[PDB]
Enzyme design. Structure first.
Site, PDB file in Angstrom:
ATOM      1  N   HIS A 102     -46.123  87.121  11.201  1.00  0.00           N
ATOM      2  CA  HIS A 102     -47.508  87.501  11.492  1.00  0.00           C
ATOM      3  C   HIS A 102     -48.508  86.367  11.295  1.00  0.00           C
ATOM      4  CE1 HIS A 102     -46.803  92.101  10.844  1.00  0.00           C
ATOM      5  NE2 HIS A 102     -46.828  91.814  12.132  1.00  0.00           N
ATOM      6  N   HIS A 327     -59.619  93.151  14.262  1.00  0.00           N
ATOM      7  CA  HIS A 327     -58.266  92.668  14.063  1.00  0.00           C
ATOM      8  C   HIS A 327     -58.210  91.639  12.936  1.00  0.00           C
ATOM      9  CE1 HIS A 327     -54.458  90.517  15.209  1.00  0.00           C
ATOM     10  NE2 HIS A 327     -54.072  91.742  15.527  1.00  0.00           N
TER      11      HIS A 327
HETATM   12  O1  GJP Z   1     -51.222  90.458  15.034  1.00  0.00           O
HETATM   13  C1  GJP Z   1     -50.380  91.154  14.420  1.00  0.00           C
HETATM   14  O2  GJP Z   1     -50.059  90.853  13.229  1.00  0.00           O
HETATM   15  C2  GJP Z   1     -49.783  92.386  15.105  1.00  0.00           C
HETATM   16  C3  GJP Z   1     -48.493  92.808  14.797  1.00  0.00           C
HETATM   17  N1  GJP Z   1     -47.965  93.873  15.377  1.00  0.00           N
HETATM   18  C4  GJP Z   1     -48.647  94.606  16.275  1.00  0.00           C
HETATM   19  C5  GJP Z   1     -48.037  95.736  16.864  1.00  0.00           C
HETATM   20  C6  GJP Z   1     -48.733  96.500  17.788  1.00  0.00           C
HETATM   21  C7  GJP Z   1     -50.034  96.152  18.147  1.00  0.00           C
HETATM   22  C8  GJP Z   1     -50.638  95.040  17.570  1.00  0.00           C
HETATM   23  C9  GJP Z   1     -49.932  94.267  16.627  1.00  0.00           C
HETATM   24  C10 GJP Z   1     -50.522  93.132  16.033  1.00  0.00           C
HETATM   25  O3  GJP Z   1     -51.833  92.773  16.398  1.00  0.00           O
END
Ligand code: GJP
Length: 438
Positions: A102, A327
């Protein structure tokens, strides 16, 4: 400002709310340095889009993509990048189930030095279009002269800590970047690195990562004040993991315990969690599709309805971003009247055991599934006892910290529900006229 904490540009707010924001094109611009090579650590990539964000004259310089994809997803990513001869890939090992890569980070090697960018956005168009995202920009780090022997280290130990984070990958392409970092002077860095790497850490390694890393930093470099039990903890995130059948299992036992640490000495501290409601998402700039990036599943949520009594709406009038869904992930420790903060963290880490770690083996081992990365702002690192909260994010006082959403956070109303991405919403349409049918 000394903090160098930015938000991404949001299409659709007034220009006063984008003055001092940064788009990815701004970060990669030749104004920031003459690019020689770059590494892009991330989770999701649109390679065609990404190359277009580099200035035309820099688009054939080497790029390393650091990712965690396996099997067909890995094949897809390689297929995306094969048209570009200058792009190499590094698959971060994920030897623990349900882990992900991530971390969102740019290493930018210039003619003039080195820059490090730690941020919260995926390398796709929608993450930089109408979302609230966070960026930390390092100073331009100069190269250490060949033949000079100096550490190039900061009072926050950032250089050693970043190398340690990269060493954990055990990857040949990142040993090259480690050697680059060794050659540069990072002594001006005034933030602490907080990373997560996958593994099971005991003994001397327990304090290296995750929420034990945070706890160690707060013990060593922050001070407890009188009535510290009155200073809330605020967590702000875009996804929630499975935290257990009640708050004592993880949230208010080990996680909150780490986050309420201050100073070296040996709970009713208020805990505010900020997470978009269904109505926040419906009325957002993106509409319901914003919920595509808030992946809280009904399967997880129905096991922990106790959690939602902690939830507060997304509100960001201070930065004109109430309709730009978050986000970014942030954690902080405000004073009881929310006018000061004892520290601030911006990170990739959501509210999950996978990201922050969970104690195992009778409390002796911290198990982490994922790669995560963030930076911690401590008043001591700036010669201060606390940070004053900036009243308007883009206004202008100089050592006041720009908190990107409103305080105090506002509790969900009785009719509000947390955004849950895999059930339908068909009662009221979004800003584009549509419903949500997963
Ligand atoms: O940026 C991330 O860490 C991440 C990781 N999994 C995700 C899974 C679905 C939608 C957005 C996601 C996301 O934005």
């Amino acid at each position: 400002n000394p903090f160098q904490f930015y938000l991404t540009r949001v299409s659709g707010v007034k220009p006063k709310y984008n003055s001092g924001a940064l788009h990815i094109k701004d970060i990669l611009s030749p104004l920031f340095g003459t690019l020689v090579s770059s590494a892009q650590f991330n989770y999701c990539f649109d390679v065609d889009w990404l190359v277009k964000q580099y200035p035309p004259e820099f688009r054939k310089k080497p790029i390393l993509l650091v990712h965690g994809d396996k099997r067909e997803a890995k094949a897809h990513l390689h297929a995306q990048a094969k048209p570009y001869e200058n792009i190499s890939l590094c698959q971060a090992k994920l030897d623990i189930a349900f882990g992900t890569h991530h971390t969102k980070m740019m290493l930018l090697l210039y003619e003039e030095g080195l820059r490090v960018v730690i941020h919260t956005s995926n390398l796709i168009h929608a993450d930089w279009h109408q979302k609230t995202q966070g960026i930390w920009l390092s100073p331009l780090y100069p190269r250490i002269a060949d033949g000079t022997h100096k550490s190039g280290e900061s009072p926050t130990h950032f250089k050693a800590d970043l190398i340690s984070y990269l060493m954990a990958y055990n990857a040949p392409s990142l040993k090259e970047w480690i050697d680059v970092i060794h050659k540069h002077d990072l002594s001006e860095t005034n933030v602490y690195l907080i990373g997560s790497t996958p593994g099971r850490f005991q003994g001397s390694q327990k304090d290296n990562w995750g929420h034990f890393r945070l706890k160690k930093l707060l013990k060593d470099h922050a001070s407890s004040m009188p009535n510290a039990e009155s200073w809330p903890v605020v967590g702000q995130f875009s996804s929630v993991g499975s935290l257990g059948a009640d708050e004592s299992k993880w949230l208010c036992s080990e996680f909150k315990e780490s986050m309420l640490t201050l100073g070296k000495e040996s709970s009713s501290v208020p805990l505010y969690l900020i997470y978009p409601s269904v109505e926040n998402v419906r009325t957002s700039l993106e509409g319901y599709p914003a919920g595509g990036s808030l992946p809280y599943s009904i399967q997880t949520a129905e096991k922990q309805n106790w959690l939602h009594s902690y939830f507060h709406k997304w509100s960001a009038e201070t930065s004109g971003r109430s309709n730009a869904m978050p986000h970014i992930k942030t954690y902080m420790r405000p004073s009881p009247d929310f006018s000061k903060i004892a520290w601030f963290l911006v990170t990739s880490a959501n509210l999950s055991k996978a990201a922050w770690g969970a104690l195992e083996k009778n409390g002796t081992q911290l198990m982490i599934r994922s790669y995560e990365l963030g930076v911690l702002f401590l008043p001591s690192a700036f010669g201060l006892d606390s940070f004053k909260v900036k009243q308007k994010f883009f206004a202008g006082p100089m050592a006041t910290f720009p908190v990107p959403y409103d305080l105090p956070p506002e509790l969900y109303g009785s009719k509000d529900r947390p955004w849950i991405w895999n059930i339908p919403y068909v009662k009221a349409p979004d800003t584009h006229g549509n419903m949500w049918v997963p």
